[PDB]
Amino acid sequence: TVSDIGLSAAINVSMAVAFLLVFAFLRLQPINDRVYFPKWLNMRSYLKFLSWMPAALKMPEDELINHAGLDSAVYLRIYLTGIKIFVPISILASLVLFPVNWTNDTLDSMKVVHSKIDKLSISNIPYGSNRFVTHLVMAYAVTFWTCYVLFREYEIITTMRLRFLASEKRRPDQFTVLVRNIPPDPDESISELVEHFFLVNHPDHYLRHQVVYNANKLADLVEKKKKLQNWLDYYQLKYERNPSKRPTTKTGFLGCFGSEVDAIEYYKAEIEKIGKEEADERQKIMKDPQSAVPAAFVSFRSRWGAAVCAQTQQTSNPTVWITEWAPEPRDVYWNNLSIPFVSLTVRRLIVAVAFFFLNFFYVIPIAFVQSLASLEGIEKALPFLKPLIKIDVIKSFIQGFLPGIALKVFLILLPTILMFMSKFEGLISQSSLERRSASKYYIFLFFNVFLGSIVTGSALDQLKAYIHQSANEIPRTIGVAIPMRATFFITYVMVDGWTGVAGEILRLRALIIFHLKNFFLVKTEKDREEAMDPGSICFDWCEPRIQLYFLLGLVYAVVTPLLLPFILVFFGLAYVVYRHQIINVYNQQYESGAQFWPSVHGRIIIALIVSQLLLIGLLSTKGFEETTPVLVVLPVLTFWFYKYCKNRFEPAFVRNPLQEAMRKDTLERAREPTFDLKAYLANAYLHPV
Amino acid sequence: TVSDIGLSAAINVSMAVAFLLVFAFLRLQPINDRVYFPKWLNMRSYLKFLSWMPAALKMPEDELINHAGLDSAVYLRIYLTGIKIFVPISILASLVLFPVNWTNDTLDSMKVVHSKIDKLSISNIPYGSNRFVTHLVMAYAVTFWTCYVLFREYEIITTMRLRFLASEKRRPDQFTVLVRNIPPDPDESISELVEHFFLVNHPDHYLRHQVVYNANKLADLVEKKKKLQNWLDYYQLKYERNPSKRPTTKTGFLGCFGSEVDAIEYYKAEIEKIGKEEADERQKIMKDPQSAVPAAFVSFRSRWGAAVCAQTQQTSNPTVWITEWAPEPRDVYWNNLSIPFVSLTVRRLIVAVAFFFLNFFYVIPIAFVQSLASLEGIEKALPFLKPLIKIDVIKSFIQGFLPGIALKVFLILLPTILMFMSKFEGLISQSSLERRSASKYYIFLFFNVFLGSIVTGSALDQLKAYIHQSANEIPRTIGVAIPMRATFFITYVMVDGWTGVAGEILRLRALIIFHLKNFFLVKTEKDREEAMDPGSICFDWCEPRIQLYFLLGLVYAVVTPLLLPFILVFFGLAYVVYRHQIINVYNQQYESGAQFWPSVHGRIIIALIVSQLLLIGLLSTKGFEETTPVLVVLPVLTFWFYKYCKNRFEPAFVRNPLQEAMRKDTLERAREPTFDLKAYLANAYLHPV
């Protein structure tokens, strides 16, 4: 009815998107498709798309790890490894698809709503003689095999991380740590009291000391200058373009009211007299004792000298001398620093409140989105066909996928606001910010996409019963309420699981930017350099995206086994596209380890628990509570295994062992007899000037 | 009815017990009352008991801490602070006692069961909209003041502990740590691989090394000899007593069949030869290579040298090289050691199963106890008065306190079995064993004394309705079910809160032992030494006892405010008696810190949460859910405060700061310039031979 027509409007677009890829692949000026390599007719129709599809899989793991994205091989464990894990799912689907072929063929009255002879293999006939037995026993293997596979998965991951841990160069991460909340100096000393403590304790050849001053007094204008340079080019570019043909007019309005811009040298004076003077004073200020926030960097002899010390509490109150692992110099978010510790709590509570209100004002969009999808049952009693368009025509009824596509439009703008809020909260490193943001986003979409959707789809479905209806008064709502929502997700997957990924290969956003930059009247001036500034930073959006699909599948796998065939079809294409885009062109620069896989486990395990707890609440209303023993002992053994893993393998992942540290230190000291480590570590964390 | 007569049978015994104390205080031979001091007529009726009652309170805190029980002043922070914390409740009880005098004096039908005009100030009249307002508002101060007081309490405790932390002598606890799960030696090396690892790392002047072999191969015969010495004396008294007057006969059955013993020298030969060779062989065994258990002791320069190292994970797998803080040499439980790590899990699961079955077979005792308490409603329809005894006489009806007293008899023997099971589980130190045992005991009595009692008191009360009864079919059970149980606790407190404590001063158990030892025909041979072997080790029993009383009071404070007057009356005498027993004679030696107070907080906070969750479940079934907003926001703040405390003050209590360590190390090094620390640390942890 709806799924039979929703597959054409998606495949017909995916093919066109894939064809344009091969079309624009053999171009001349747009070399962004392979911008990373130079860092240092039926012939082309049916035999031209295989130029990179089978070649992408020909990269062994060693070659991937030993290439760009040193810490990205573990990221490729969501698609490449995803299929493997999902394999056990397709294998068991190969056996449960027969109950689907042996439960749908049982015809009955089928009075669900109104004589709908469709896919209804879920609740054909209640009180099944010998049919629900398999439906209950399958839950065992549904968990036992996936956990057994995840066990080996986490084992392989830990082994490869430990191996890679012994094949790393000399980075300042293990050397330099960040110590904050130094006691307030008695208005006389700035650093005489800091170093005085690091010498009484284990000296370990205390290296240079860097006192962090108030960031957001000079860093503000530093960023303004980094931006005024682009604006300088935007203002200097008009003086080398307009006058090329003839000086006639300028842009003018460009935002606020006003006729047009006056001159160029006059606009260049704004960043000169008013630009230099303002920057000259604050640059003298940071070389003066105007404001010195209690924050600094500490180092030791080698990695072991800092790993053994940066793990305990120095003082006797957990509010002073907070020692953390400083990230790489490229990941330091120098802007949102020098924040007092007292406010860190407030910014965690106030900003949270504003978030809790967003959920209350973001409920009507779902209703407005879930009100134009399934016409049948809405326009039957109160409303009717409106003029200028006939709804009886199939061309009007096949538009059920329109809201599914329009939903994405109302979802790509809020992540930016969420990121801005998380930045306003204030943290230490961006590696943790990029993870907490996604963590908050997922829990936001959890109580809204899954728990917030059904609650709104049942009320809007039952409150439309006026005359020609059924009982529906007290109890006759929870029976068939979830199966009715699967029709929406079927379309959601086709509009987001197929086009959402295809829309990223073409890069419709940055491509227009490149075309615009191509009209900058520049021959070779930094053309090879500014064209590789934007990257492919999509972790914040991609990480919560896969978990939703995993949750939906794990929940509907036992209810609707007809959805598991339509999920891997896309997972494969996403995996190969990401494999293609990782090695060829990604421009990723944020590696700080792989400390995000346990976060996935503990968040899919709770997802499985949620599914098992929701299963016992629907099929247990038929008759006797004969199914409760299994659905109550399974989640117990589920968390028991989780606890076991958290005790066995988790501590070895987020911590730093001291046995391999000395082992690696011995070799790194026996290879290079010269010290030569205080040179690049002194001027490692500083400002541009 | 029952509480009016239960107070006489308890007070009349407490006075008799207190009088016997003063009687036996001025004795000559029984000097056990003041055995710790020599370690180096209306005149005596109304003016003789005040000889030690007001004097015990005249000991300042400095004198208590600077006396026997260095880590016992914090244990008295239970009765002393208890009353202080109660003071707030008491202060509140004074204001709420008027609502009690203004809610009970309003007479109504009072058809609870059968025209029982008694203390029924709980649910006299329906809502009224003029009385429950105060009952709902009082819950605020019920928690806010106690939390505010506990805040200052935990603050004072932390400060005094940190102060005491800088006034301790040189103990081997901070110096010697226990490292277990050393990798299995390759059948060639015993200790050559230990020092090999500790010399590549931070040397820190690695002190002597002790390899722990299989404990339960020599420890067995060591204990058999320590016991055979007592048996040797028990066999020598046979020759020192019977031949004194005349040799006539000897012992007989003595547990097993047989006429009588044969001779003395023949019984003394058992210890030697067969018992001598056995010990001779295994003593040679421990000196030779037979079984080298992977466990040893590690030391460093000073306390700081070991505190900074014994806090992280050495290896990369959290199953090898487990480093723990070794207790004092007197607390080392050498018997239950050398246990493999693989079994530690099994012993934690199997022994647990056997425990979970005990709860299923320990349910009928409660039912038998609550079968003869309130004969009113039990002997009314099916049973009647039995011959040879008339129940209509008050002398027979006043026996309601008999089961309350008999319950204690069925409760003093199971703690020993629990202790034996906890020992069989296997741990490292006794300081943790003595705490986990009490921890298990409390959770055992929690689901049985409180949750297991009411469930069994309601069923047995509702299943006795045959003819002259009321509805009692579907809903008519939760109305008045908890108020009916208060009568049982009123008697429980008088039979255990008054006599249980008084029964400890006289020491009816060890006193008989002393009288028997007095007939050993010994003039001065170690009489001053063997008479001080038994101590006053009652922490395992006393710690769970107070929490039950606290829980009952905190739960009934809002329901039945008539119980709070009858709890402090005893807490005061318990406190003074414990002060007396701590100052004069306690003979305890298990001090290993004070890391047990947070365990109390986190276990009374959950108790308060349980009370607040049980209140919303009884009075919210009357009508509208107008009380749910308060009873749902209060426990949230309760958890908000608990987490805040856990974040703020808890880490500073269980851990060892590195700031004060160096401070104390500087002084301890500046006072004694000589090293002189390898002497007493070498032969610090060894066997008797």
A637 — contact with chain B (CB < 8 Å)?
no
Place of tokens 């010697």: B176
Question: Could you say which of B162, B316, B659 has the minimum Cβ distance to residue A162?
Answer: B316
**Per-residue three-class SS string for A366-392:** HHHHCCCCCCCCCCCCCCCCCCCCCCC
What is the β-pairing status of strands B210-211 and B295-298?
A: antiparallel
Q: Which residue of A has its CA nearest to B204?
A: A202
Radius of gyration of the CA atoms of chain A, in A: 30
Place of tokens 């009726």: B45
Dihedral sign for Cα atoms in the order B537, B541, B547, B553: negative
B652 — contact with chain A (CB < 8 Å)?
yes
B345 — contact with chain A (CB < 8 Å)?
no
Residue A658 and residue B162: Cβ atoms within 8 Å? no
And the tokens for A612? 């098992």
A318 — contact with chain B (CB < 8 Å)?
yes
First to last CA, chain A: 66
Distances, alpha carbon B39 to alpha carbons A45, A120, B36, B471, B527, in Å: 103, 87, 5, 70, 13
How far is the C-alpha of A440 from the C-alpha of A432, rounded, in Å? 12
B389 — contact with chain A (CB < 8 Å)?
no
* DSSP states of A609-630: HHHHHHHTTTGGGSSSS-SHHH
For residue A529, give the amino acid letter: E
Distance (Å) from the alpha carbon of A674 to chain B's nearest alpha carbon:
20
Distances, alpha carbon B20 to alpha carbons B26, B47, B48, in Å: 11, 15, 12
Q: Taking the CA of residue B513 as centre, how many other CA atoms within 13 Å lie in the half-sphere pointing to its CB?
A: 12
B420: exposed, middle or buried (C-beta count within 10 Å: 0-12, 13-18, 19+)? exposed
CB A338 within 8 A of CB A214: yes
CB A312 within 8 A of CB B658: yes
For residue A360, give the amino acid letter: F
- Residues contacting residue A2 through CB under 8 Å, at least 6 positions apart: A374, A398, A400, A401, A487, A490, A491
Give the residue ranges of DSSP H helices in A531-617: 539-559, 568-583, 597-615
Q: Taking the CA of residue B96 as centre, how many other CA atoms within 13 Å lie in the half-sphere pointing to its CB?
A: 28
Residue A648 and residue B316: Cβ atoms within 8 Å? no
CB < 8 Å to A648, chain B = 318-319
Q: What are phi and psi of A312, to 5 degrees?
A: -115, 175
Beta strands in A193-264 (DSSP E): 210-211
Q: What are phi and psi of A659, to 5 degrees?
A: -80, -50
C-alpha angle with apex B378: B375 to B380, nearest 5 degrees?
95
- Residues contacting residue B276 through CB under 8 Å, at least 6 positions apart: none
Say which DSSP state A261 is in. -
Could you give the strand order of the β-sheet that contains B295-298, starting from the edge strand earlier in sequence? B210-211, B295-298, B177-180, B322-325
And the tokens for A613? 């707890």
For residue A99, the cross-strand partners are none
Q: Taking the CA of residue B275 as centre, how many other CA atoms within 13 Å lie in the half-sphere pointing to its CB?
A: 18
CB A359 within 8 A of CB A447: yes
A167 — contact with chain B (CB < 8 Å)?
no
C-alpha angle with apex B648: B647 to B650, nearest 5 degrees?
75
Question: Could you say which of B318, B657, B658 has the minimum Cβ distance to residue A651?
Answer: B318
CB < 8 Å to B664, chain A = none
Distances, alpha carbon B233 to alpha carbons B29, B75, B264, B520, in Å: 22, 38, 11, 10
Distance (Å) from the alpha carbon of B323 to chain A's nearest alpha carbon:
13
Beta strands in A223-313 (DSSP E): 295-298
Q: Estimate the crossing angle of helix B539-559 against helix B430-445, to 10 degrees.
A: 30
Distances, alpha carbon B261 to alpha carbons B228, B246, B256, B271, B602, in Å: 17, 16, 12, 16, 57
B319 — contact with chain A (CB < 8 Å)?
yes
Helix (H, G, I), strand (E, B) or coil at B469: coil
Residue B313 and residue A660: Cβ atoms within 8 Å? no
Q: Estimate the crossing angle of helix A628-648 against helix A132-165, to 10 degrees.
A: 10
Q: What are phi and psi of B385, to 5 degrees?
A: -65, 135
Distance (Å) from the alpha carbon of B316 to chain A's nearest alpha carbon:
5
Report which secondary-structure segment, H or E, holds B160.
helix B132-165
CB < 8 Å to B200, chain A = 662, 666
For residue A211, the cross-strand partners are A296
B166 — contact with chain A (CB < 8 Å)?
no
Question: Could you say which of A313, A647, A666 has the minimum Cβ distance to residue B657?
Answer: A313
CB < 8 Å to B657, chain A = 313-316
What experimental approach yielded this model? cryo-EM
Cα A486 off chain centre by: 25
Residue A316 and residue B662: Cβ atoms within 8 Å? no
How far is the C-alpha of B223 from the C-alpha of B233, rounded, in Å? 16
B184 — contact with chain A (CB < 8 Å)?
no
And the tokens for A444? 């936001």
B412 — contact with chain A (CB < 8 Å)?
no
Question: Could you say which of B647, B651, B659 has the minimum Cβ distance to residue A314?
Answer: B659
And the tokens for B453? 């009692």
Question: Could you say which of A201, A647, A660 has the minimum Cβ distance to residue B316?
Answer: A660
For residue B468, give the amino acid letter: H
A647 — contact with chain B (CB < 8 Å)?
yes
B308 — contact with chain A (CB < 8 Å)?
yes
B353 — contact with chain A (CB < 8 Å)?
no
Residue B662 and residue A162: Cβ atoms within 8 Å? no
And the tokens for B182? 């050393």
Size of interface A-B (CB pairs under 8 A): 63
A111: exposed, middle or buried (C-beta count within 10 Å: 0-12, 13-18, 19+)? exposed
Question: Could you say which of B308, B309, B313 has the minimum Cβ distance to residue A655?
Answer: B313
And the tokens for A524? 């070779």
B249 — contact with chain A (CB < 8 Å)?
no
A667 — contact with chain B (CB < 8 Å)?
no
Count the Cβ atoms, other than its own, within 10 Å of residue A677.
Answer: 18
Place of tokens 């129940």: B391
